[PDB]
Amino acid sequence: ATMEEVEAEKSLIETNTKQRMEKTIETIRSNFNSVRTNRASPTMLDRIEVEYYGTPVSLKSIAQISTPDASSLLISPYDKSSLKAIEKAIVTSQLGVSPNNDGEVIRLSLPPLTSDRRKELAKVVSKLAEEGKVAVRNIRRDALKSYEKLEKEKKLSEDNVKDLSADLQKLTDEYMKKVESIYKQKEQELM
């Protein structure tokens, strides 16, 4: 178990972690944005498509999305024939909003935050954080096995594993703090 072997076995296993930790933190942030806590919605209306002369086309190409207020939204359709198609898609999408019409445009109104919704919604926010922590702990759980597999194969010493393992926890614990930090700023958004 020369030093050149410890560096290589450290470099191989460690890069699989860091390259895997960044995948989790990237996807975990996407799980928060999918909760859609009625802050602002230039993004919600993007995935809804509509039919325009036998062509499924996104709403972004057919009309403009302007946010005059955080709790509302304005759609300026260039074609009046395409206005009704937008109303159909929003309702069939079942997002949870009742669109209105003023004869020219479509206006949305995100509802207010209720107490019953905030608690049921807060349970989802905590649940996603739990799914993030277990994702990290599985990576700590996978990395330490490989150090033990090298040990049983007599390519590392007992002394090397205790050093790498103790040094590997410091790496993961840094990424753990990123989980709470994203959770702290989110819990402030509930109010």
Partner: protein, 106 residues
């Protein structure tokens, strides 16, 4: 795999998201008997609504010529474009499976 494809904008323009949806469906139904066929013919159409009088309806005509004197004719009509593509692909997978059951009758 290793099979060509032919689309046709009969009464409209063929988009890219649509073309991806076409390859996804027939790619499933044809991947099974992929070593029997060489090409895939497709013809999309649209009618009604704002274009013509009557209910909006979009046709998807799909023809297939295998490597051994096989001919398939499939035509369906639906209210949307993707729904029309879905129903036709189910018909091809039905008749395409009917052929192997006759060849593998023994």
């Amino acid at each position: 795999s290793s099979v060509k494809l032919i689309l046709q904008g009969r009464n409209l323009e063929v988009s890219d998201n649509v073309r991806s949806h076409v390859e996804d469906k027939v790619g499933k139904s044809v991947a099974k008997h992929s070593h029997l066929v060489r090409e895939v013919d497709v013809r999309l159409s649209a009618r009604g609504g704002d274009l013509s009088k009557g209910p909006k309806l979009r046709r998807c005509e799909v023809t297939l010529f295998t490597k051994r004197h096989g001919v398939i004719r499939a035509e369906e009509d639906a209210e949307s474009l993707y729904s029309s593509i879905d129903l036709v692909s189910s018909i091809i997978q039905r008749k395409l499976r009917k052929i192997k059951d006759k060849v593998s009758d023994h």
